[PDB]
Amino acid sequence: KKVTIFFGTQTGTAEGFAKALGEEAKARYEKTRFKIVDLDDYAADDDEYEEKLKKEDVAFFFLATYGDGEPTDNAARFYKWFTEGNDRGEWLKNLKYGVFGLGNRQYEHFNKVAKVVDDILVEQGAQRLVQVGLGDDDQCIEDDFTAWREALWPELDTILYTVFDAQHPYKANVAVKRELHTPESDRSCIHLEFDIAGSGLTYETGDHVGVLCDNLSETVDEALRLLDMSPDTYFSLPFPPCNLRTALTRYACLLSSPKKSALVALAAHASDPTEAERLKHLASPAGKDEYSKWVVESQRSLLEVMAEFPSAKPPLGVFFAGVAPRLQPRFYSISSSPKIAETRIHVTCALVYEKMPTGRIHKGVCSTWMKNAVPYEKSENCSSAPIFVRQSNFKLPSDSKVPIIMIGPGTGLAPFRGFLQERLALVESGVELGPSVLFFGCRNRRMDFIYEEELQRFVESGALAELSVAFSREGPTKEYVQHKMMDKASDIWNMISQGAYLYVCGDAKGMARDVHRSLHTIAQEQGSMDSTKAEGFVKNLQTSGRYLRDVW
Ligand SMILES: Cc1cc2nc3c(=O)[nH]c(=O)nc-3n(C[C@H](O)[C@H](O)[C@H](O)COP(=O)(O)OP(=O)(O)OC[C@H]3O[C@@H](n4cnc5c(N)ncnc54)[C@H](O)[C@@H]3O)c2cc1C
Ligand SMILES: Cc1cc2nc3c(=O)[nH]c(=O)nc-3n(C[C@H](O)[C@H](O)[C@H](O)COP(=O)(O)O)c2cc1C
8 A cells, every 4th residue: 555645835834744744654654655745746747647646545635725725836737637627527436535734714715725625535536534634824733733643543544759858858949039029118028939840849739838947157156156165066966967067057946935944954054053043943833924024025045045044054965955946947838829830839938027025136047048049030050948848728629619718918818829820720721710709918009019910810810709908007097807808797708608618827816816806706797696606606617627727
């Protein structure tokens, strides 16, 4: 019998509990083999989650809930596969499980993520070993952990041609690199095309493309200063061996905020006892509000923190394990369709450039690379990058007559450009299209209306029926996609009634929530149902697979 322990965490508490449970369960049942898994590492795509989760015997889930009841970033992909378009009957009958939830009762959606995953698991056949844990952070979450653990043992005691992917990427030339905003814009959105002619690399409309990126050299220089060793230091340690400068450039996530366990790791190698104690304090329960404020809210990079604690000098083995997380690929919603762009993968990338609360100037590692990438046109020598394709569920209905409702302001437009290229190639070939509507949004006609002429052409060909555009900064007044949806509330409801698919893409924190509320509001007023029923209605659309979100 196996035991796998999954975690979804941001600051590291859920991960700490998962390590703790494993260590202690290994004491009790010294024969059975355990495994601690980050949910993002567990599977590359949905097909992989499926093939793996069925082979499970015992599984514990440590899920922390964030912003408006959503999953952490490292579990968002697992969460979407498991809770949306998720009607798969009882396929987990061989599974034994328990889920402890990391939450905070001060929030509207207390332990939402843990509750949702827990309910579905039993609905789909798996067997509860323990009731769902409901730890809240405004009280003592550790105390709820031990109670949950104590509840678990009684039941646990009597139970115990190439594939291109992130490890083998394809090296693609940058064929096209183009600013989508006008010169007047204070921001930037890059249109970029990767050349895949002859590669064997394949993609579908709505898939994602992963791009491997290096830290900027300014970032590496500073990390080199803090570690205080030569750039050419060779070391053991699981990425392939290289010098220190290379490791920092390619495998070290340096600009993210340190998890509590990273603070603990630094503290074990801090020379000054008051620095060791302060780091430990910041990692401890007593230092929780300090951690939340000084680290998480201020968005302090690892490099800032290490600078504040000059005596923390971790060995390279510790630094590349528990201090600096692995540098991740960045994913982009492919903004082309294979039927039009057969030999190129199109990308729509917003430049990340922001002043952090500390005054630190953050340049996005990947988007800054794309901003500076050299295309064929200017080329004597173009840029290139290692890429791979990841399948997703953000797909057009098989039946092109089914109505489609697309909501994507800003960069959220990306995969819809792919939706429209695909529909365009369909309609040029005789296939009939059903109704279509796109809610788009930007700041200003004279700055921000990306792909404006292509959108005109899509209306012009019948790939898209109507285009609605919301302008947030053209003068005194301010409109958003929420307001345009409300104006067309009746049309939207009628489309849902006729079986429409709903798609939302773009900003997760702001837009997606407001768009979500509007659907509930539309369902209540156009559907003549109270608030509770409409939430039932909207949730039904999600589990059915007719309300799809690609947000970040
Ligand atoms: C499924 C999916 C699809 C996506 N599709 C697109 C797309 O089509 N187009 C697009 O432009 N992007 C898309 N994204 C987002 C994209 O993958 C990248 O996150 C984005 O490009 C930023 O990458 P970066 O390396 O340039 O910036 P990063 O360096 O990764 O920075 C990202 C953000 O983190 C913030 N940040 C900086 N420091 C901290 C800190 N210490 N603590 C907390 N936060 C901090 C930054 O201000 C910044 O906003 C998608 C993401 C996902 C998951
Ligand atoms: C921005 C933010 C939003 C949060 N939102 C919720 C929430 O909606 N519901 C909830 O129960 N807890 C919420 N919490 C509480 C966290 O789940 C709690 O801090 C948790 O213990 C953190 O887990 P982690 O350290 O593994 O990331 C939120 C915390 C933060 C910082």
